[PDB]
Symmetry: C2
Amino acid sequence: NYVMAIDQGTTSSRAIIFDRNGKKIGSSQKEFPQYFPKSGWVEHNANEIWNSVQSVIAGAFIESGIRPEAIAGIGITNQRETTVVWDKTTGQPIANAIVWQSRQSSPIADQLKVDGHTEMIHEKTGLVIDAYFSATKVRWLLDNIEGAQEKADNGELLFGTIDSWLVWKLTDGQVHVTDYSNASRTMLYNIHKLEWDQEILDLLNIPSSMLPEVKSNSEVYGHTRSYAFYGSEVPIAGMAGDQQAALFGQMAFEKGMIKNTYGTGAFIVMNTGEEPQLSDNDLLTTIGYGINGKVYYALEGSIFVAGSAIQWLRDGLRMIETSPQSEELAAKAKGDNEVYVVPAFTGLGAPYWDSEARGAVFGLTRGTTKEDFVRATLQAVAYQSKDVIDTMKKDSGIDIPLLKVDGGAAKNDLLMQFQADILDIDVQRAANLETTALGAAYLAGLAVGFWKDLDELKSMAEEGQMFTPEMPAEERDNLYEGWKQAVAATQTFKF
Amino acid sequence: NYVMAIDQGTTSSRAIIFDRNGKKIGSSQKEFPQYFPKSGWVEHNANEIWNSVQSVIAGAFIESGIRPEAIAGIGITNQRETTVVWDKTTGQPIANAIVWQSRQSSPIADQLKVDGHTEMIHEKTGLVIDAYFSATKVRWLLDNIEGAQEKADNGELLFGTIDSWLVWKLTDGQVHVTDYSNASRTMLYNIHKLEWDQEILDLLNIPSSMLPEVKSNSEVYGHTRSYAFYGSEVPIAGMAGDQQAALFGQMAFEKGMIKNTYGTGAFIVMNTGEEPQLSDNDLLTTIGYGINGKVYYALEGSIFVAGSAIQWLRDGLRMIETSPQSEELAAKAKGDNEVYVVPAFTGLGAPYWDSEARGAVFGLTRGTTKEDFVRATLQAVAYQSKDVIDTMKKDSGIDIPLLKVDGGAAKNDLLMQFQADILDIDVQRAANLETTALGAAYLAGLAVGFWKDLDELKSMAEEGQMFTPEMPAEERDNLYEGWKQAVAATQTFKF
């Protein structure tokens, strides 16, 4: 009667039990520790990630009353790029996972750019050389953890993005698999030919004995053998990197269809059908998902720092008491809107890909208030999303009249209205802001035949909220122009 | 037996009684209202300024026990540029005073540059065309206050900077005067020929009937006829703009001696002897003081926003509860000193004179704390003061080995050591940070023979402390590099 989704996020994990109608019948959420050993580094402990996941599985069962034997399948979805390396026999990570947020491995990406590898790597993976992606993280771990390169060389070490790490734990070590969307983010996988790339692996000295089998996004990978499911061998049947799962949960199945998820980072992903579309040094060409013997590619713009800028306001400046306070403060801003925050703490993501940029603020006067400051900080995401979406218009030739939206931070009505005004395009927000987890559930539920099809269409389609652009061209243009100026000035600070 | 100095500053006034040894016997200080009717305007009510001054005169008398008949002369010192225009017969300001801080008349200053007068004004006044100075504020009041141009044309209105206003009020309207230093700030006075400049008055259609008589900085201007001094015709005998009063108070009497006052703004002033130095269009050539028949000139770099950045923290961001708290927060910063705050809310002052720049922040990361942000905001003034002092050693061939410092904010020992460190120059620090009020009292006391001469020397020089540069070249150069980047980037945001 139900499908469980596990959504293993950057700051928290969640498990959600959905029924045949696509409705939430049970759920549990648990934060886990974030580690910053040096500025610019972000790590997680993959065991503490795994316990967070055990906790929410058990929690969703405990609170709902539902037991494992009622679950038709499990979908898994996850913060992408984040890299685990673990000993195959003891199942222990050789060190902390390194988060997609981290830039600890940036020297290794810099050297790759120095040695001339840009276009080769972009033509195989669709990606920009950067420490965002898993390849340099696996190289970092092989360079810096004593003994590890030799073990990997001896076949004793496994690599996994978090999806892979989860299925391995959930099967108690039986299955080492990743799906095409997560593999496409490692910068080790050739997204054209659909295989791990030997040349990139030899170049970074990564033995291929580390690597999981890659499979589609909707098939039974294996069955649980695990405490919180115990005794049921529940099929693990749906897997996608979170931003692709969101793309899926949006039903963005046709070429051109685009969503943005507003969370710790924000990720604009457009389905480009069964063929990949050309790059530049601006968007990423990536894999949406593989299902029904077909692979759908996607174009993506990545905005690394979005809701985590709010967390900085809370934690770093202590300007706000909690993160929900940002929305109240910002609603109360009285300034002309001439302050701009460009919270690019770790570098600017799409369409700039400038790793050396850091966060900056512009247009401050003696009248600037806490409220003005918080609002500017929120609006950065909507402006950079425009940067992205206009680039995708240019790169796609595809005019875009509808942006679908989801993610915890999409709950802010004024932000969503600003986003539509600034874009001059309609913005439709999902009823259930966790379409990430729904997308994983849909993939799992199709695999095990809980749902027969994609055209069990928007059968289920509860969702609505439409934000229609109501800002005149003049205002919208002056706003965006100040943003572009702020970004160009941010880029000139290269100390 | 005693001298009183009145220091009418930007946010408060103060009155100090000093004995013949220069010691403080009594003081009183009192804030008065600040008005900001539009973003970038700053105004005072001149009547409120006058009541704040009667208030602090009375308080110094009440708290010291000294009485007006025991006061040998009065010195007067004031926020400069700040412009008051009044009716000679009612005594009433035609409108709010317009503060040196405001830029409301900046369209007037732009049109003067457009019309090609920059070199003419600079040659005559030593100054850069800007709405910082009194000239465009008078023109603004004559543009904007109904009927005032015709009254001024009819000889019915008087202009004065705040020294001139307080002497008018203290003598019950019998004396309309200003000293060389304050008049040098108006951009209406020719500091070479030592007269009001007729060509500049015609250009700005300001009638000479508005203008006070311009006199030396140490002579009997008149006598009080006023409540707080009632029954004593107390000699009013010393007057300088607050910053030239600081230079005097510090005994920087010789060519090359230089001070910095850390106050609301920060203003570095070097005595250039009896000739001017050549300025760049990057420093101001101004009058330091006229005494003993001679006129001493000065070079100055003005930094508009220094301690007012810290009031912005308090009142705009509410990042700090009180201004003093800044010191504590910054002392506690653990970041690597890579955040820069360029708090140029009203434009950049010297050496930039960029009226379009606004406040900006750079180098922010997830680890930036309140304490780092506060510390960067405090260090701005030290970095800009080095821009200025380097410019000055550049325009005048001469190493500067010692900067004397005063002002409220020089009480911050860490900011002073940082100041010395990044300069590689010794920094002294006056024993009494009210060297402004001291320099005024000196000027009044020389004039009435209370002290006989300048070489009643350093006789009284009661003082030092000392901050010796102790940061290596590598560290200072990197700190500074990052500051020049941040300002270059701030000047690129020209939205």
